[PDB]
Write a protein that binds this ligand. Structure first.
Ligand code: MG
Ligand code: MG
Ligand code: MG
Ligand code: MG
Ligand code: MG
Lengths: 67, 263, 319
RNA sequence: AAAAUAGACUACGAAAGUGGCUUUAACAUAUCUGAACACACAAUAGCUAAGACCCAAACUGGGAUUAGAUACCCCACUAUGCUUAGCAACAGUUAAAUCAACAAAACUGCUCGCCAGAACACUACGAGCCACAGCUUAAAACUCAAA
RNA sequence: AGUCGUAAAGUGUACUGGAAAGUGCACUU
């Protein structure tokens, strides 16, 4: 899980608010949940990922979240 | 076209909001339009706003709670002052919450006290036995005895009002419904100290409205009361809230309530 | 002397038209025995002129009339009790003179004859005040009457009239507090440089028919022949208030606020040095002689500086 | 300035405590018990010096209200809230009748500290501050058959 | 004693001069 892979990290945020999903929604084991969380924050603060919304270019990727 | 401006006056918990909701037919200034008649109901806080509402009033509806033993026997002095300064406006008495009375013949005596024995300019002579701060208001045009909660004879008052007419956000809604359920189910001050935060609001794959709402409270005991035994309390609220939403937006709604402590 | 029986709480609820016991917003002493005690502690009232405030149901009234007073002037605010007091007056003809009005504005100086006026240096002038008022009214009243003693007017046109008033237990303790005590405050000094003040006894809350959550003290005031500070009342009041505004800090922290900021540092020091107040004295450790010294020096400072006495430091902090 | 989501996680730290990102240092110890007196921390009161002052705010003023108004509403502004510098343990057992009760199922072994009526009673002979009249500061006797 | 009368809420602490208790700060269910 890399902070530059914004496509993968956008598969774990809310399309309308940009909030990160929890493990009850994502289904990840807690360690990979922590990796995804830290990567998302790193990307957001380093100017790679939007924070208040999901980047529209990635709205049509496979839905891996149970929401 | 006939129009009537009617203002509701009375004690705080006399049920003015309840009666307004029943007349409107919806739980909501209100406007009732029927055929050629328009009735503008003005709900005022219980006793500046009531007097300002009187400044544009065509009729006054004075509600008195008959179940309240402490206040049923008199009209409050501020209400009497309000009527006196605006005596020119017609006034109608409504005795609310009659369903709560065990011995309902009491109502009769109350009328004599509240109307000072005079209604619509006619004295109420009553068979008399074997042979200063005003307490009532003798200029009431008419008397009604109803129970706003059960809609008992609210239709009669509605028809009366129609007769006296003279020629001339969705998130907020969900929050209000959740607040109503919290008030109904939670005790004492707890429902007043619950902060709501919308966490998710979207359309699911099946066209349903997926709602995740977060209930924030300042104390752990409030969390325990909210969740209830085995999660029953909160669960109940959600379902009922969801059911209400079924009728409001007219779709499928998946509402999930989660409780967190305010840090 | 046969008098009507005391009204029970049932008749009192009926009289006030409340129809229940938890809506009085008032506590009555309906125990004629404690009122006997209070009237006993007021002194020897035989052929005395008693100005009784806050009559209420009339336990104090009955107790006082039981003592052989000459005239008993009653001043009641509520009109629902005037009927009972009129029955009392009829039962004891010539002794009870009832009046309607506020005690905070009623003029006692004209009430009694001018043949009772004794000189200030002589004995108390056979005219007594007894009072069981609401505690929301007895504190402004005692402040007003303390000003009157300072000016030798009002009820004290007859001389050194003695007062017997009921206060809250804490307020009574503070009125009769000694130097260094934990209850020493503004009220202690203000009462004590003009009066001999004695907290006689405390009545527990359980003795009042609607029982309050507080105790009630009875305090006796006798105006002093020689006041311990010979200055205007408002000046002493200002000095005491500024001293006691910071009750737990040194006395100079409160005394610096009497002066404008521009001259705060030097003027405060000049005040303290022309007085002999050690600046490490905390406010509860100041006797009335320390306040006399501060008041004299402050009167001087005002007299050679007109603007000073009107200064309020909060009105300067607003800008 | 302080860190929504993750966090339905329960990790790090001796404790208090730590949850925005990056980077740099960096997270003692191969048996246990053993400190009032040694070294480090930590928290809780209360005062003392200076300093900042947006905001809030005991006290203190001002305005409105019944017929002892609202203690309760509104305005202004203090102390203060801020910033510095100071004043039972450890290892093993669930076998036994477990089992005064109530809590929190009872146990052993081994070590340290502590406990032998009410009584951590009451009391100012006095002492300090004060400077004639007030404040702060105590143990013991004594008594009782209870607590 | 009758020879007497009668039927949201809390805990602390600080200040309190409109104190039959109020307000401020911190806590508990
Ligand atoms: Mg060790
Ligand atoms: Mg402010
Ligand atoms: Mg040990
Ligand atoms: Mg106050
Ligand atoms: Mg308090």
């Amino acid at each position: 899980v890399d902070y530059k892979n914004v496509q993968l990290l956008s598969q774990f945020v809310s399309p309308f608010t940009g909030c990160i999903y929890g493990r009850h929604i994502t289904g990840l084991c807690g360690k990979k949940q922590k990796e995804i969380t830290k990567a998302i924050k790193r990307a957001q603060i380093m100017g790679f990922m939007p924070v208040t919304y999901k980047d529209p270019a990635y709205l049509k990727d496979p839905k891996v979240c149970n929401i | 076209s006939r129009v009537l401006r009617v203002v509701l006056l009375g004690a705080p918990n006399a049920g003015k909001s309840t009666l307004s909701n029943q007349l409107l037919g919806r739980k909501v200034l209100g406007v009732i339009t029927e055929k050629e008649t328009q009735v503008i109901l003005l709900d005022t806080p219980g006793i500046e706003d009531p007097w300002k509402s009187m400044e544009s009033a065509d009729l006054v509806v004075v509600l008195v709670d008959v179940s309240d033993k402490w206040t049923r026997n008199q009209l409050s002095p501020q209400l009497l002052r309000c009527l006196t300064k605006y005596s020119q406006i017609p006034s109608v008495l409504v005795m609310n919450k009659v369903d709560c009375l065990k011995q309902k013949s009491v109502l009769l005596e109350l009328t004599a006290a509240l109307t000072e024995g005079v209604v619509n300019g006619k004295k109420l002579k009553m068979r008399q036995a074997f042979h200063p701060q005003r307490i009532g208001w003798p200029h009431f045009k008419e008397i009604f005895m109803l129970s706003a909660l059960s809609q008992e004879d609210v239709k009669t008052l509605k028809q009366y009002l129609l007769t006296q007419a003279q020629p001339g956000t969705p998130e907020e809604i969900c929050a209000n419904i959740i607040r109503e359920k919290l008030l109904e189910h939670l005790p004492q001050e707890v429902p007043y100290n619950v902060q709501q935060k919308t966490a998710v609001w979207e359309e699911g794959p099946g066209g349903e409205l997926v709602i995740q709402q977060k209930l924030l409270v300042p104390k752990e005991s409030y969390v325990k009361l909210l969740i209830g035994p085995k999660g029953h309390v909160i669960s109940q609220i959600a379902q009922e809230a969801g059911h209400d939403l079924m009728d409001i937006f007219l779709c499928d709604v998946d509402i999930r309530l989660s409780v967190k402590l305010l840090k | 002397c046969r008098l009507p029986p005391l009204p029970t709480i049932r008749e009192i609820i009926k009289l006030l038209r409340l129809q229940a016991a938890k809506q009085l917003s008032q506590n009555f002493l309906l125990d004629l025995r404690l009122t006997d005690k209070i009237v006993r502690k007021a002194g020897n009232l035989t052929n005395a002129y008693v100005y009784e405030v806050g009559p209420g149901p009339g336990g104090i009234t009955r107790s006082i009339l039981n003592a052989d007073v000459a005239e008993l002037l009653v001043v009641e605010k509520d009109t629902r009790f005037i009927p009972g007091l009129q029955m009392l007056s009829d039962a004891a003809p010539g002794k009870l003179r009832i009046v309607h009005g506020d005690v905070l504005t009623f003029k006692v100086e004209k009430a009694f004859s001018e043949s009772l006026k004794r000189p200030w240096e002589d004995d108390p002038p056979n005219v007594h005040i007894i009072g069981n008022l609401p505690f929301s009214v007895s504190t402004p009243l005692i402040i007003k009457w303390l000003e009157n003693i300072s000016c030798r007017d009002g009820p004290f046109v007859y001389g050194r009239t003695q007062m017997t008033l009921t206060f809250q237990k804490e307020v009574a303790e503070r009125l009769a507090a000694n130097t260094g005590s934990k209850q020493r405050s503004r009220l202690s000094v203000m009462a004590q440089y003009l009066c001999n003040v004695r907290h006689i006894f405390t009545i527990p809350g359980q003795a009042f028919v609607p029982k309050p959550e507080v105790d009630v003290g009875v305090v006796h005031f006798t105006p002093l022949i020689q006041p311990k500070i010979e200055q205007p009342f408002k000046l002493v009041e200002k000095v005491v208030q500024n001293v006691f505004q910071f009750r737990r800090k040194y006395c100079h922290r409160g005394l610096r606020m009497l002066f404008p900021e521009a001259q705060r540092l030097e003027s405060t020091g000049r005040l303290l040095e022309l007085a002999d107040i050690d600046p490490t004295l905390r406010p509860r450790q100041l006797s009335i002689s320390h306040f006399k010294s501060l008041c004299d020096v402050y009167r001087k400072m005002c007299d050679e500086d007109p603007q000073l006495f009107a200064y309020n430091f909060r009105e300067e902090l607003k800008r």
